[PDB]
Amino acid sequence: ATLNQMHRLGPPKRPPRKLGPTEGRPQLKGVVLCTFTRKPKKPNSANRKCCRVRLSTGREAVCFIPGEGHTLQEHQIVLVEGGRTQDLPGVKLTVVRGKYDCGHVQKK
Amino acid sequence: YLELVSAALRRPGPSLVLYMVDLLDLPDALLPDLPALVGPKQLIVLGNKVDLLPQDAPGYRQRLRERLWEDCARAGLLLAPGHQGPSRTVVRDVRLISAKTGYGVEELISALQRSWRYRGDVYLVGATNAGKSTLFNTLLESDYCTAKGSEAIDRATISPWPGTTLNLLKFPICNPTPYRMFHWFYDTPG
């Protein structure tokens, strides 16, 4: 582009950055509605532990529960953070272990 | 109305009624009384003031059209939309318009100038606040009218209603297109 064209158009204008599942917040509080398991996309095979939660913003979302063994039931309060579960499509939220009802993974 | 205007509107021949109903003011208590008011002739229900309605959800217009259809159904009105085949009051169409913004008026004109059965005189019936006068002014200044001059004073004429002294406006209209390949407008008291 010529100097006149760049003067006309002006400085480049970066589009506003996209808000993620947490809407630009570190963590979010949520209420568990139901627990289930999902199957990974296939270079891999497993039964990943997931749960649907209603967030404080009112939106519902599927979250992955890390670690071996969880005791989450319906109506329990959890704190969920960002981070994609790479093998589960559409699962962008992860439950924080050791906060509210979701306890730490039992040793061994 | 029943003792003065219904006589002319129950003269046999080719005729059409553009019944106008205010969308905000529903249910219409005048709707069940149409069979006696106008008689057993073709009727198009026009929901006016649709632009003034908040859009509660997508497709609210279809819900309003349906609601008008069941409101016609509850009364003893025959619902015969679209092609029917080779009497009592028959509702041909339910069309949402807004005379102020001219939303749906042009499509109304196109619908009126596309069918065999919409032949003859048009009688714009309605209630007082339905908004009849705005629609009359809108339709008056359009290709729908057979204009001989531009000024709206001469284009529309005043005539006394038959059998009475009620002077009302009227402008002459065109026959629908099928009647050239191989009639007056009327506003009635609200």
Binding site: - | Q84, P178, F182
Partner: protein
């Protein structure tokens, strides 16, 4: 039930004495698996009487016999395949009844017993037709059988017999086309006011051993209890043909040709006005109700004018 193995294309070339693979002038479906699919889509054939047309090598025959049919009537035109079908009959005694003759003239109405004849308004009468014929023969056949449904004769003396026929993909689409679709044509209306027509699935050309340059559709017909036009078949055929002769022009441009020139202008208008057809409707936008209206008014016009129904405008343009 053990049956002989399917003949490979080598044995088929040897059997037809061509000695080469590029001279068949015919495409065979030698995939018993797709034929299993077709026979599955034909419905539940358990203890059914199947009239199978265009047997050929016998993939469809083997698939049907694999289902527990009662009698399987086979009608083959070629005599080089009767040996294979006789071996099939011997392998499955009592079920395969082979016949030699043309399907366009064979009389199915006497083939099966008269204890299978159900009434027209009741369920389909346990008698099925399955067919993988040359596309040069399936179109005349379906026209003939549509006339038979209109007259309630022929294969439909047993009632509402269901048909499963293979057509070309375009022809199948047109047979099962909806109003306004780009495939809506004469064949759509002619099939659809007499039958429930369903284009189930398409078999690509690469699945046939000599691969054709076309796809193949499978279409299922079920005669309708109440036909959507109660007129003679030839009258409806004439009306539909004259409507669809000009597919891209308004419907009146095609409907004016039903009448002599002398009364063309007035008679066409009278037809349209006693019907309620908006003359700006193009032929693909006409439902079967519009054709019912036109057919009723045209039957009237013929009944108060004897000469009209035989009129052909090209026979008048010759002079």
């Amino acid at each position: 039930c053990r049956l002989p193995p399917l003949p490979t294309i080598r044995e088929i070339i040897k059997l037809l004495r061509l000695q080469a693979a590029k001279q068949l002038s015919q495409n065979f479906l030698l995939d018993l698996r797709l034929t299993d699919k077709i026979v599955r889509k034909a419905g539940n054939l358990t203890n059914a009487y199947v009239y199978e047309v265009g047997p050929g090598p016998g993939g469809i025959t083997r698939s049907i016999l694999n289902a527990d049919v009662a009698e399987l009537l086979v009608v083959e035109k070629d005599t080089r395949f009767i040996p294979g079908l006789q071996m099939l009959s011997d392998a499955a005694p009592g079920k395969l009844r082979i016949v030699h003759g043309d399907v366009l003239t064979f009389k199915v109405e006497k083939a099966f017993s008269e204890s299978l004849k159900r009434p027209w308004e009741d369920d389909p009468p346990n008698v099925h037709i399955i067919g993988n014929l040359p596309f040069s023969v399936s179109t005349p056949l379906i026209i003939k059988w549509l006339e038979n449904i209109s007259c309630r004769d022929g294969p439909f003396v047993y009632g509402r017999t269901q048909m499963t026929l293979t057509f070309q993909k375009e022809v199948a689409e047109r047979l099962a086309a909806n109003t306004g679709s780009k495939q809506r044509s004469r064949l759509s209306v002619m099939a659809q006011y007499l039958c429930n027509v369903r284009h189930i699935f398409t078999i690509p050309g690469q699945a046939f051993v000599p691969k054709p340059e076309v796809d193949v559709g499978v279409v299922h017909f079920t005669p309708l209890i109440q036909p959507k036009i109660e007129q003679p078949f030839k009258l409806v055929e004439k009306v539909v043909q004259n409507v669809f002769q000009f597919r891209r022009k308004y419907c009146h441009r095609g409907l004016r040709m039903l009448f002599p020139e002398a009364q063309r202008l007035e008679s066409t208008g009278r037809l349209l006005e006693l019907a309620d057809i908006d003359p700006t409707l193009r032929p693909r936008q006409l439902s079967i109700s519009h054709f019912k209206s036109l057919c009723d008014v045209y039957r009237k016009m013929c009944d108060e004018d004897p000469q009209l129904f035989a009129y052909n405008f090209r026979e008048e343009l010759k002079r």
